[PDB]
Short mmCIF file of C-alpha atoms and ligand atoms in Angstrom, two decimals:
data_model
loop_
_atom_site.label_atom_id
_atom_site.label_comp_id
_atom_site.label_asym_id
_atom_site.label_seq_id
_atom_site.Cartn_x
_atom_site.Cartn_y
_atom_site.Cartn_z
CA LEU A 1 7.13 14.72 -38.98
CA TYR A 2 3.56 15.75 -38.10
CA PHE A 3 2.22 18.29 -35.55
CA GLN A 4 3.49 17.63 -32.01
CA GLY A 5 4.64 14.20 -33.24
CA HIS A 6 6.97 13.95 -30.26
CA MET A 7 4.47 14.63 -27.45
CA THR A 8 0.77 13.97 -28.24
CA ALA A 9 -1.28 11.62 -26.07
CA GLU A 10 -1.52 9.26 -29.06
CA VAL A 11 2.23 9.14 -29.61
CA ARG A 12 2.69 8.51 -25.89
CA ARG A 13 -0.13 5.99 -26.03
CA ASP A 14 1.63 4.26 -28.92
CA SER A 15 5.00 4.28 -27.15
CA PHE A 16 3.58 1.82 -24.63
CA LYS A 17 2.00 -0.43 -27.27
CA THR A 18 5.35 -0.37 -29.09
CA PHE A 19 7.18 -1.32 -25.90
CA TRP A 20 4.87 -4.26 -25.35
CA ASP A 21 5.09 -5.22 -29.03
CA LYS A 22 8.70 -6.18 -28.22
CA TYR A 23 7.39 -9.02 -26.04
CA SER A 24 4.56 -10.40 -28.22
CA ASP A 25 7.04 -12.96 -29.57
CA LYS A 26 7.22 -14.23 -25.98
CA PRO A 27 3.70 -14.64 -24.63
CA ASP A 28 4.99 -16.14 -21.37
CA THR A 29 5.38 -15.40 -17.65
CA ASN A 30 8.82 -13.90 -18.27
CA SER A 31 7.20 -11.07 -20.24
CA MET A 32 4.26 -10.61 -17.86
CA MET A 33 6.64 -10.04 -14.99
CA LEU A 34 9.53 -8.66 -17.07
CA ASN A 35 11.84 -11.08 -15.26
CA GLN A 36 14.29 -13.58 -16.72
CA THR A 37 13.35 -16.10 -14.03
CA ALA A 38 9.65 -15.38 -13.62
CA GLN A 39 9.11 -19.11 -13.14
CA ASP A 40 10.66 -18.70 -9.67
CA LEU A 41 8.15 -16.06 -8.62
CA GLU A 42 4.96 -16.51 -10.63
CA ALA A 43 2.77 -18.86 -8.58
CA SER A 44 3.65 -17.33 -5.22
CA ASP A 45 3.05 -13.80 -6.53
CA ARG A 46 -0.30 -14.77 -8.07
CA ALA A 47 -1.38 -16.40 -4.79
CA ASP A 48 -0.34 -13.30 -2.81
CA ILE A 49 -2.58 -11.18 -5.02
CA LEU A 50 -5.51 -13.58 -5.45
CA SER A 51 -5.69 -14.43 -1.75
CA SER A 52 -6.17 -10.72 -1.02
CA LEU A 53 -9.37 -10.47 -3.06
CA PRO A 54 -12.92 -10.87 -1.80
CA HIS A 55 -14.71 -14.11 -2.67
CA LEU A 56 -16.10 -13.95 -6.20
CA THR A 57 -19.05 -16.38 -6.15
CA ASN A 58 -21.78 -15.11 -8.53
CA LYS A 59 -19.80 -11.97 -9.31
CA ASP A 60 -18.79 -10.41 -12.63
CA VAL A 61 -15.11 -9.47 -12.98
CA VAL A 62 -13.16 -7.47 -15.55
CA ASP A 63 -9.44 -8.25 -15.73
CA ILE A 64 -7.84 -5.36 -17.63
CA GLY A 65 -4.32 -5.78 -19.00
CA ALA A 66 -4.69 -9.50 -18.34
CA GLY A 67 -1.99 -10.49 -20.85
CA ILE A 68 -1.64 -14.27 -21.17
CA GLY A 69 -4.21 -14.42 -18.39
CA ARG A 70 -2.46 -15.98 -15.41
CA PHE A 71 -4.97 -14.27 -13.09
CA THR A 72 -7.92 -14.71 -15.47
CA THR A 73 -7.37 -18.46 -15.27
CA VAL A 74 -7.95 -18.55 -11.51
CA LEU A 75 -10.47 -15.68 -11.32
CA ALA A 76 -12.89 -17.56 -13.58
CA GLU A 77 -12.80 -20.56 -11.21
CA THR A 78 -15.15 -18.79 -8.80
CA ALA A 79 -16.44 -15.64 -10.53
CA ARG A 80 -19.67 -15.99 -12.48
CA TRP A 81 -18.03 -14.39 -15.50
CA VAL A 82 -14.75 -12.70 -16.37
CA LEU A 83 -13.98 -10.26 -19.18
CA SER A 84 -10.29 -10.48 -19.99
CA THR A 85 -8.67 -7.69 -22.04
CA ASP A 86 -5.20 -6.73 -23.31
CA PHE A 87 -3.92 -4.50 -26.11
CA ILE A 88 -1.40 -7.09 -27.31
CA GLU A 89 -3.08 -9.58 -29.65
CA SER A 90 -0.76 -12.56 -29.21
CA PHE A 91 -1.13 -12.31 -25.43
CA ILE A 92 -4.91 -12.60 -25.69
CA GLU A 93 -4.38 -15.48 -28.11
CA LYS A 94 -2.15 -17.27 -25.59
CA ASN A 95 -4.80 -16.45 -22.93
CA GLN A 96 -7.50 -18.19 -25.03
CA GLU A 97 -5.29 -21.24 -25.53
CA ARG A 98 -4.41 -21.76 -21.86
CA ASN A 99 -8.05 -21.23 -20.91
CA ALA A 100 -9.67 -23.23 -23.72
CA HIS A 101 -11.00 -25.61 -21.08
CA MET A 102 -13.13 -22.88 -19.50
CA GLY A 103 -16.45 -21.46 -20.64
CA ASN A 104 -17.11 -18.33 -18.56
CA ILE A 105 -14.42 -16.06 -19.99
CA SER A 106 -14.97 -13.37 -22.60
CA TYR A 107 -11.93 -11.99 -24.45
CA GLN A 108 -11.23 -8.57 -25.89
CA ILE A 109 -8.29 -6.99 -27.68
CA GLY A 110 -8.08 -3.26 -27.08
CA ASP A 111 -6.48 -0.44 -25.13
CA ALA A 112 -7.71 0.09 -21.55
CA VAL A 113 -7.88 3.81 -22.34
CA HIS A 114 -10.69 3.13 -24.87
CA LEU A 115 -12.53 0.44 -22.93
CA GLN A 116 -16.22 1.15 -22.37
CA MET A 117 -18.86 -0.83 -20.48
CA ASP A 118 -22.27 -0.15 -18.98
CA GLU A 119 -22.70 1.55 -15.62
CA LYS A 120 -22.90 -0.83 -12.65
CA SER A 121 -21.90 -3.72 -14.88
CA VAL A 122 -19.16 -5.38 -12.79
CA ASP A 123 -18.44 -6.24 -9.17
CA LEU A 124 -14.65 -6.36 -9.40
CA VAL A 125 -12.29 -4.37 -11.58
CA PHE A 126 -9.06 -6.34 -11.43
CA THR A 127 -5.71 -5.02 -12.54
CA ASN A 128 -2.10 -5.92 -11.79
CA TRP A 129 0.73 -3.77 -13.21
CA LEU A 130 -1.29 -1.32 -15.37
CA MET A 131 -1.42 2.28 -14.07
CA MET A 132 2.37 2.48 -14.50
CA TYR A 133 1.73 2.11 -18.26
CA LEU A 134 -0.74 5.03 -18.36
CA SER A 135 -0.16 8.80 -18.20
CA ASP A 136 -1.31 10.71 -15.12
CA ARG A 137 -4.41 11.95 -16.93
CA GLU A 138 -5.23 8.44 -18.17
CA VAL A 139 -4.88 6.97 -14.66
CA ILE A 140 -7.47 9.44 -13.40
CA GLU A 141 -9.70 8.79 -16.42
CA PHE A 142 -9.31 5.04 -15.93
CA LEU A 143 -10.33 5.32 -12.27
CA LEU A 144 -13.40 7.43 -13.01
CA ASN A 145 -14.38 4.78 -15.58
CA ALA A 146 -13.93 1.96 -13.08
CA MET A 147 -16.10 3.99 -10.76
CA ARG A 148 -18.82 4.25 -13.42
CA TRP A 149 -18.68 0.51 -14.17
CA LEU A 150 -18.66 -0.72 -10.59
CA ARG A 151 -21.84 -1.60 -8.71
CA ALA A 152 -22.24 -0.15 -5.20
CA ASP A 153 -20.16 -2.21 -2.70
CA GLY A 154 -17.99 -3.16 -5.69
CA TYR A 155 -14.20 -3.38 -5.49
CA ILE A 156 -11.15 -2.52 -7.57
CA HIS A 157 -7.76 -4.16 -7.14
CA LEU A 158 -4.62 -2.36 -8.28
CA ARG A 159 -0.96 -3.32 -7.95
CA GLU A 160 1.87 -1.15 -9.21
CA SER A 161 5.65 -1.00 -9.28
CA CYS A 162 6.14 2.05 -7.12
CA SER A 163 9.21 4.32 -7.35
CA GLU A 164 11.37 1.70 -9.13
CA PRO A 165 11.05 -1.36 -11.35
CA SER A 166 10.02 -4.64 -9.73
CA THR A 167 13.56 -5.88 -10.33
CA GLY A 168 15.12 -2.78 -8.77
CA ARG A 169 17.79 -0.45 -10.15
CA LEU A 170 18.92 -2.47 -11.91
CA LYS A 171 18.86 -6.25 -11.56
CA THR A 172 20.17 -8.68 -14.17
CA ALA A 173 16.81 -10.24 -13.35
CA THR A 174 15.20 -7.64 -15.59
CA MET A 175 13.86 -8.27 -19.09
CA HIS A 176 14.11 -4.55 -19.71
CA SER A 177 16.63 -3.34 -22.25
CA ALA A 178 19.83 -2.08 -20.63
CA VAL A 179 20.28 0.58 -23.32
CA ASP A 180 16.75 1.60 -24.36
CA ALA A 181 14.82 4.16 -22.34
CA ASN A 182 12.16 2.65 -20.09
CA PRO A 183 8.83 4.50 -20.63
CA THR A 184 7.24 3.08 -17.48
CA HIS A 185 5.84 5.46 -14.85
CA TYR A 186 7.21 4.39 -11.47
CA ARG A 187 5.11 6.58 -9.18
CA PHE A 188 5.33 6.96 -5.40
CA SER A 189 2.99 4.61 -3.51
CA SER A 190 1.57 7.58 -1.61
CA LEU A 191 0.25 9.13 -4.84
CA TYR A 192 -1.89 6.14 -5.69
CA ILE A 193 -3.39 6.04 -2.18
CA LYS A 194 -4.09 9.79 -2.14
CA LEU A 195 -5.61 9.79 -5.63
CA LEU A 196 -7.95 6.96 -4.70
CA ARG A 197 -9.09 8.70 -1.51
CA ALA A 198 -9.59 12.01 -3.33
CA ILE A 199 -11.97 10.81 -6.04
CA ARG A 200 -15.61 11.91 -5.81
CA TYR A 201 -17.81 10.70 -8.67
CA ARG A 202 -21.42 11.64 -9.40
CA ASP A 203 -23.17 8.92 -11.38
CA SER A 204 -25.91 9.32 -14.00
CA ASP A 205 -28.57 9.18 -11.28
CA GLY A 206 -26.83 12.05 -9.53
CA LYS A 207 -25.45 10.00 -6.64
CA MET A 208 -22.00 10.71 -5.20
CA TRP A 209 -19.34 8.06 -4.63
CA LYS A 210 -15.91 7.76 -3.09
CA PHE A 211 -13.29 5.06 -2.76
CA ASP A 212 -12.59 3.39 0.58
CA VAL A 213 -8.96 2.27 0.28
CA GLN A 214 -9.00 -0.74 2.55
CA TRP A 215 -5.23 -1.19 2.73
CA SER A 216 -1.85 -0.69 1.17
CA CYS A 217 0.50 -3.68 1.32
CA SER A 218 3.78 -4.83 -0.19
CA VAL A 219 3.57 -8.03 -2.23
CA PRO A 220 5.17 -10.71 0.02
CA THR A 221 6.94 -12.59 -2.80
CA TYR A 222 8.77 -9.44 -3.90
CA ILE A 223 10.06 -8.79 -0.42
CA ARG A 224 11.20 -12.37 0.20
CA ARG A 225 12.79 -13.04 -3.16
CA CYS A 226 13.58 -9.60 -4.59
CA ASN A 227 14.20 -7.57 -1.40
CA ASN A 228 11.68 -5.12 -2.85
CA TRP A 229 9.04 -3.53 -0.59
CA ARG A 230 7.76 -1.24 -3.35
CA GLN A 231 5.55 -3.71 -5.19
CA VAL A 232 2.46 -2.18 -3.69
CA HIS A 233 -1.18 -3.19 -3.99
CA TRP A 234 -4.52 -1.92 -2.72
CA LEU A 235 -8.06 -3.20 -2.39
CA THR A 236 -10.52 -0.35 -2.73
CA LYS A 237 -14.31 -0.27 -2.27
CA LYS A 238 -16.93 1.94 -3.96
CA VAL A 239 -18.98 3.54 -1.19
CA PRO A 240 -21.41 6.46 -0.90
CA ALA A 241 -20.06 9.98 -0.35
CA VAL A 242 -23.20 11.79 0.86
CA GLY A 243 -22.99 15.58 0.59
CA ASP A 244 -19.57 15.60 -1.05
CA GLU A 245 -18.73 17.53 -4.24
CA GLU A 246 -17.38 16.06 -7.50
CA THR A 247 -13.69 16.10 -8.25
CA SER A 248 -13.03 16.94 -11.89
CA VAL A 249 -10.19 15.47 -13.96
CA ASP A 250 -8.40 18.83 -14.02
CA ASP A 251 -8.75 19.29 -10.24
CA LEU A 252 -7.42 15.78 -9.62
CA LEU A 253 -4.65 16.14 -12.21
CA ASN A 254 -3.20 19.23 -10.53
CA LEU A 255 -2.92 17.31 -7.29
CA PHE A 256 -1.70 14.01 -8.72
CA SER A 257 0.85 15.52 -11.13
CA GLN A 258 2.24 18.53 -9.26
CA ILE A 259 1.05 19.25 -5.69
CA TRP A 260 1.38 15.76 -4.16
CA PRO A 261 4.71 14.66 -5.69
CA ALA A 262 6.11 17.96 -4.43
CA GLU A 263 4.79 17.40 -0.91
CA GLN A 264 6.18 13.86 -0.99
CA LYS A 265 9.61 15.17 -1.95
CA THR A 266 9.75 17.47 1.09
CA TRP A 267 8.99 14.51 3.35
CA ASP A 268 11.74 12.44 1.72
CA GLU A 269 14.12 15.30 2.54
CA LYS A 270 13.09 15.31 6.18
CA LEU A 271 13.02 11.57 6.78
CA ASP A 272 15.36 9.65 4.46
CA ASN A 273 18.55 10.18 6.47
CA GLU A 274 16.95 9.11 9.75
CA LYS A 275 19.72 7.17 11.53
CA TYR A 276 17.53 6.22 14.52
CA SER A 277 14.29 7.33 16.22
CA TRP A 278 14.35 9.66 19.21
CA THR A 279 11.96 7.24 20.88
CA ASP A 280 14.57 4.44 20.82
CA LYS A 281 16.11 5.59 24.10
CA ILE A 282 12.66 5.83 25.69
CA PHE A 283 11.35 2.45 24.52
CA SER A 284 14.65 0.89 25.62
CA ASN A 285 13.50 0.99 29.24
CA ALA A 286 10.10 -0.68 28.63
CA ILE A 287 10.68 -3.28 25.93
CA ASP A 288 12.56 -6.45 26.88
CA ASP A 289 12.52 -10.07 25.70
CA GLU A 290 9.50 -10.73 27.91
CA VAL A 291 7.57 -8.18 25.83
CA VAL A 292 9.20 -9.32 22.58
CA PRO A 293 10.28 -12.97 22.58
CA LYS A 294 12.88 -14.05 20.01
CA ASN A 295 11.38 -14.78 16.57
CA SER A 296 7.99 -13.35 17.60
CA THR A 297 5.90 -11.02 15.41
CA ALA A 298 5.29 -7.57 16.90
CA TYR A 299 2.37 -5.36 15.90
CA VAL A 300 3.53 -1.75 15.62
CA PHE A 301 1.19 1.22 15.23
CA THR A 302 2.49 4.74 14.47
CA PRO A 303 -0.09 7.35 13.36
CA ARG A 304 2.41 10.23 13.64
CA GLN A 305 -0.19 12.85 14.54
CA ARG A 306 1.69 15.20 16.87
CA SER A 307 4.89 14.94 14.86
CA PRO A 308 6.29 13.09 11.84
CA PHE A 309 9.23 12.07 14.02
CA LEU A 310 7.08 10.42 16.69
CA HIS A 311 7.22 6.73 15.77
CA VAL A 312 8.76 3.34 16.55
CA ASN A 313 12.09 2.28 15.07
CA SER A 314 10.79 -1.03 13.74
CA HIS A 315 14.11 -1.89 12.13
CA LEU A 316 15.90 -1.52 15.46
CA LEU A 317 13.11 -3.50 17.09
CA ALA A 318 13.55 -6.41 14.68
CA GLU A 319 17.34 -6.22 15.01
CA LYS A 320 17.61 -6.08 18.79
CA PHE A 321 14.92 -8.64 19.58
CA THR A 322 15.36 -10.92 16.55
CA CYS A 323 11.67 -10.56 15.81
CA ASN A 324 9.42 -9.87 12.83
CA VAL A 325 7.49 -6.61 12.72
CA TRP A 326 4.32 -5.31 11.09
CA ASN A 327 4.19 -1.52 11.39
CA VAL A 328 0.97 0.30 10.53
CA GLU A 329 1.21 3.86 9.18
CA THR A 330 -1.77 6.18 8.65
CA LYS A 331 -0.03 9.07 6.87
CA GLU A 332 0.52 8.31 3.16
CA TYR A 333 3.66 10.43 2.78
CA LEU A 334 5.25 8.98 5.90
CA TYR A 335 4.31 5.43 4.90
CA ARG A 336 6.18 6.00 1.63
CA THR A 337 9.33 7.03 3.57
CA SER A 338 9.04 3.81 5.57
CA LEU A 339 9.03 1.86 2.30
CA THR A 340 12.12 3.80 1.23
CA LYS A 341 13.87 2.83 4.46
CA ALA A 342 12.73 -0.80 4.09
CA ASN A 343 14.27 -1.12 0.62
CA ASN A 344 17.60 0.28 1.73
CA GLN A 345 17.85 -1.83 4.89
CA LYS A 346 16.70 -5.09 3.27
CA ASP A 347 15.64 -6.76 6.53
CA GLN A 348 12.82 -9.04 5.39
CA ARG A 349 11.53 -9.36 8.94
CA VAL A 350 10.22 -5.78 8.82
CA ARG A 351 6.97 -4.99 6.99
CA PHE A 352 4.77 -1.90 6.70
CA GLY A 353 1.19 -1.32 5.69
CA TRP A 354 -0.93 1.77 5.28
CA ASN A 355 -4.43 1.95 6.70
CA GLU A 356 -6.81 4.88 7.16
CA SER A 357 -7.22 4.10 10.88
CA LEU A 358 -6.55 1.53 13.58
CA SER A 359 -9.97 0.01 12.90
CA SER A 360 -8.97 -0.57 9.27
CA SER A 361 -5.86 -2.55 10.24
CA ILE A 362 -7.78 -4.55 12.83
CA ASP A 363 -10.35 -5.60 10.18
CA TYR A 364 -7.58 -6.72 7.83
CA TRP A 365 -5.89 -8.85 10.47
CA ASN A 366 -9.17 -10.12 11.90
CA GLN A 367 -10.12 -11.43 8.46
CA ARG A 368 -6.78 -13.22 8.37
CA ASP A 369 -7.05 -14.81 11.85
CA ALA A 370 -3.84 -13.14 13.00
CA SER A 371 -2.65 -13.33 16.58
CA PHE A 372 0.36 -11.05 17.05
CA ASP A 373 2.73 -11.61 19.98
CA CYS A 374 2.84 -8.05 21.36
CA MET A 375 2.03 -4.41 20.55
CA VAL A 376 4.36 -1.41 20.48
CA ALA A 377 2.76 1.92 19.60
CA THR A 378 3.07 5.69 19.70
CA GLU A 379 -0.04 7.90 20.17
CA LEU A 380 -2.54 5.03 20.56
CA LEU A 381 -4.76 6.55 23.26
CA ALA A 382 -4.20 10.03 21.82
CA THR A 383 -5.62 9.22 18.37
CA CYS A 384 -7.96 6.21 18.77
CA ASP A 385 -11.28 5.71 20.56
CA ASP A 386 -12.15 3.07 23.17
CA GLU A 387 -14.15 0.99 20.71
CA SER A 388 -11.12 0.56 18.40
CA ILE A 389 -8.63 0.00 21.20
CA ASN A 390 -10.83 -2.64 22.82
CA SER A 391 -10.78 -4.59 19.55
CA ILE A 392 -7.00 -4.89 19.49
CA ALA A 393 -7.31 -8.09 21.55
CA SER A 394 -9.04 -9.81 18.62
CA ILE A 395 -5.66 -9.80 16.83
CA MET A 396 -3.48 -10.44 19.93
CA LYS A 397 -2.44 -13.76 21.44
CA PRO A 398 -3.67 -14.40 24.98
CA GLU A 399 -1.59 -12.34 27.45
CA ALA A 400 0.18 -10.38 24.72
CA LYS A 401 2.10 -7.50 26.30
CA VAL A 402 1.87 -3.92 25.09
CA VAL A 403 4.07 -0.84 25.44
CA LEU A 404 2.65 2.61 24.69
CA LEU A 405 4.41 5.96 24.42
CA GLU A 406 1.82 8.69 24.78
CA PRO A 407 1.88 12.47 24.32
CA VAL A 408 -0.14 14.23 27.03
CA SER A 409 -0.64 17.68 28.51
CA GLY A 410 -1.67 17.38 32.14
CA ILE A 411 -0.74 14.01 33.59
CA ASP A 412 -3.89 12.17 34.68
CA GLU A 413 -2.71 8.69 35.67
CA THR A 414 -5.98 7.59 37.30
CA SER A 415 -7.89 8.40 34.12
CA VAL A 416 -5.39 6.69 31.81
CA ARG A 417 -5.69 3.49 33.83
CA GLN A 418 -9.46 3.67 33.60
CA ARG A 419 -9.48 3.99 29.81
CA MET A 420 -7.16 1.02 29.36
CA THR A 421 -8.95 -1.02 32.04
CA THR A 422 -12.21 -0.29 30.18
CA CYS A 423 -10.60 -1.41 26.93
CA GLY A 424 -9.55 -4.71 28.45
CA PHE A 425 -6.00 -4.19 29.65
CA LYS A 426 -4.50 -5.56 32.86
CA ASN A 427 -1.33 -5.03 34.89
CA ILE A 428 -1.10 -1.38 33.88
CA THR A 429 1.98 0.60 34.90
CA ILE A 430 2.57 4.24 33.99
CA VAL A 431 5.93 6.03 34.00
CA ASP A 432 6.35 9.75 33.34
CA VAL A 433 9.07 10.00 30.66
CA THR A 434 8.73 13.74 29.91
CA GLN A 435 12.27 14.82 30.80
CA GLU A 436 13.88 11.81 29.09
CA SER A 437 11.80 12.52 25.97
CA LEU A 438 12.73 16.21 26.06
CA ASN A 439 16.41 15.26 26.12
CA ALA A 440 16.15 12.55 23.47
CA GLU A 441 14.03 14.58 21.04
CA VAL A 442 16.41 17.56 21.10
CA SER A 443 19.44 15.27 20.69
CA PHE A 444 17.76 13.69 17.68
CA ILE A 445 16.88 16.98 15.98
CA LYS A 446 20.33 18.53 16.38
CA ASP A 447 21.98 15.30 15.22
CA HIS A 448 19.96 15.26 12.01
CA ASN A 449 20.14 19.05 11.57
CA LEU A 450 16.37 19.33 11.40
CA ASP A 451 15.49 23.01 11.78
CA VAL A 452 12.31 22.13 13.62
CA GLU A 453 10.97 22.51 17.16
CA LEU A 454 10.40 19.77 19.72
CA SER A 455 6.99 18.08 19.67
CA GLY A 456 6.56 20.08 22.86
CA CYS A 457 4.36 17.58 24.67
CA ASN A 458 4.68 15.65 27.91
CA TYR A 459 5.11 11.87 27.64
CA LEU A 460 3.92 8.76 29.44
CA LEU A 461 5.43 5.34 28.92
CA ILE A 462 2.85 2.65 29.61
CA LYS A 463 3.15 -1.15 29.85
CA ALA A 464 0.24 -3.58 30.21
CA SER A 465 -1.20 -6.81 28.88
CA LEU A 466 -4.53 -8.29 27.85
N1 SAH B 501 -3.38 0.63 -22.09
C1 SAH B 501 -3.41 -0.74 -22.05
N2 SAH B 501 -4.51 -1.41 -22.43
C2 SAH B 501 -4.57 -2.74 -22.40
N3 SAH B 501 -3.53 -3.48 -21.98
C3 SAH B 501 -2.40 -2.88 -21.58
C4 SAH B 501 -2.31 -1.49 -21.60
N4 SAH B 501 -1.10 -1.16 -21.15
C5 SAH B 501 -0.41 -2.27 -20.85
N5 SAH B 501 -1.21 -3.31 -21.13
C6 SAH B 501 -0.95 -4.77 -20.84
O1 SAH B 501 -0.76 -4.96 -19.47
C7 SAH B 501 0.16 -6.07 -19.31
C8 SAH B 501 1.28 -5.65 -18.53
S1 SAH B 501 2.31 -6.91 -17.72
C9 SAH B 501 1.23 -7.73 -16.52
C10 SAH B 501 0.27 -8.76 -17.11
C11 SAH B 501 -0.79 -9.30 -16.09
N6 SAH B 501 -1.52 -8.16 -15.52
C12 SAH B 501 -0.15 -10.11 -15.03
O2 SAH B 501 0.27 -9.56 -14.02
O3 SAH B 501 0.21 -11.23 -15.29
C13 SAH B 501 0.58 -6.46 -20.68
O4 SAH B 501 -0.19 -7.56 -21.10
C14 SAH B 501 0.26 -5.30 -21.50
O5 SAH B 501 0.01 -5.68 -22.82
C1 BOG B 502 12.44 0.11 19.25
C2 BOG B 502 13.05 0.02 20.61
C3 BOG B 502 14.52 -0.47 20.56
C4 BOG B 502 14.96 -1.23 21.83
C5 BOG B 502 16.40 -1.80 21.70
C6 BOG B 502 17.36 -1.60 22.70
C7 BOG B 502 18.42 -2.67 22.96
C8 BOG B 502 17.80 -4.09 23.08
O1 BOG B 502 18.77 -5.03 23.57
C9 BOG B 502 18.32 -6.34 23.54
O2 BOG B 502 17.86 -6.73 24.91
C10 BOG B 502 17.53 -8.17 25.02
C11 BOG B 502 17.27 -8.49 26.42
O3 BOG B 502 15.93 -8.88 26.55
C12 BOG B 502 18.65 -9.07 24.52
O4 BOG B 502 18.17 -10.43 24.52
C13 BOG B 502 19.09 -8.69 23.14
O5 BOG B 502 20.27 -9.47 22.78
C14 BOG B 502 19.44 -7.24 23.04
O6 BOG B 502 19.71 -6.91 21.68
C1 BOG B 503 6.80 -9.99 9.12
C2 BOG B 503 5.35 -9.73 9.35
C3 BOG B 503 4.46 -10.61 8.45
C4 BOG B 503 3.70 -11.70 9.21
C5 BOG B 503 2.28 -11.26 9.68
C6 BOG B 503 1.44 -12.22 10.25
C7 BOG B 503 0.44 -11.81 11.32
C8 BOG B 503 0.71 -12.51 12.67
O1 BOG B 503 0.70 -13.92 12.44
C9 BOG B 503 0.90 -14.65 13.59
O2 BOG B 503 2.35 -14.88 13.75
C10 BOG B 503 2.65 -15.68 14.95
C11 BOG B 503 4.10 -15.88 15.01
O3 BOG B 503 4.61 -15.03 15.99
C12 BOG B 503 1.92 -17.01 14.90
O4 BOG B 503 2.19 -17.75 16.11
C13 BOG B 503 0.45 -16.79 14.74
O5 BOG B 503 -0.24 -18.07 14.64
C14 BOG B 503 0.14 -15.96 13.54
O6 BOG B 503 -1.25 -15.68 13.50
NA1 NA B 504 6.96 4.02 -3.10
#
């Protein structure tokens, strides 16, 4: 019965510690994952996350919210040193017991909100399921702190339950109470990505920094076993932001708390009822089972520059050709809507990732020695340069076939061939699909009652191979 006893940051801070207090009697993987059968998922999930990290030889790592330390255990195998923290005492105690055989782990009991360390004191800030237990202001404050603590070239890993609990709404799998309110913040995936990209931090030497969000990916184990695409994680690098201006906590908070979630909601309203893509009819006359063999993996790239509706229906692709699909998105809000679709369809063959550019996705897949079976893309030539397009082959099998739908103004077929021939393509054919696209786009808009105009561009449908 004290001042603002229902709403202060401390009361809200303590509501999370109280929630986790309920599990301190069970310092086990069930609590860490809030899943009655966490044994089924734990090792595969941990491997999904740990295999996404950079090598840690000679590096200092801080694992914040480490709990019983299932990541700490493996992180300290290669890192020079790991600081492992959690605000639940028994969890840290269980952490110290499991890891009694190791000698390069420091332990701390405390709230992540109050954690303090020297500038440029770590190389990796590792978290997994933590931001969702902080307020919007605390998330921003946490990220500015990570920025302070990281050395240049340093990384931060984050993984959050986005939009819904890991166990969905609501699985008997959950360890959540069916009657108690759940205090957890299930934010949209797009908000995390945008916040990370927005941050500009000036250090004590007066140097500016920004985050390079290397990727956004769904945790594979949660798709395969929980039909959940919204367990989202990101690897993010601290890099110089020459000439940029600082972003304050208040300036970031306005965006993160009000502006962005609002903008996301308008995109949900436009895209969530999408029954098919207007491009389906167009791609139908260029994609066959010679382009997409049965059980192959297709690489799909949809930047959605000219229009949010210009993309590839990856679900229809996977359905009609019995293939797996990786679809790259570059627009945060539109990537989120693809995750929404993925969760409702529950076709595990279809996967999405967010990257800043084509080059970003190519690096990711290069590092993983991927060789996709084909490419289907909208706006490839329109949005990417020769250098990036030429590097697509480094993630394609020999003779992989491609199909491109391209918005153009004047039709310059000779020039289009020369770009693609310069970027390593062969057997190039070009078909003008402007009238077909005009018909299909209008049919699609009227059918979905979108009060919008046509993209208004001409279209080429291109097929080639490498
Ligand atoms: N503000 C905070 N400071 C420190 N630890 C926190 C915290 N908020 C939540 N936690 C801890 O974060 C953990 C959440 S569950 C996930 C545990 C671990 N990251 C893993 O994936 O296995 C719990 O251990 C909880 O106690
Ligand atoms: C994203 C573009 C959607 C294209 C789907 C259109 C219908 C595809 O039709 C497919 O054609 C194949 C012939 O090669 C058959 O083997 C498949 O059984 C059939 O589903
Ligand atoms: C569903 C999408 C997730 C899988 C992404 C993996 C990247 C491509 O993986 C590739 O898949 C091919 C199978 O067609 C294999 O033959 C290749 O060896 C493999 O590199
Ligand atoms: Na989401």
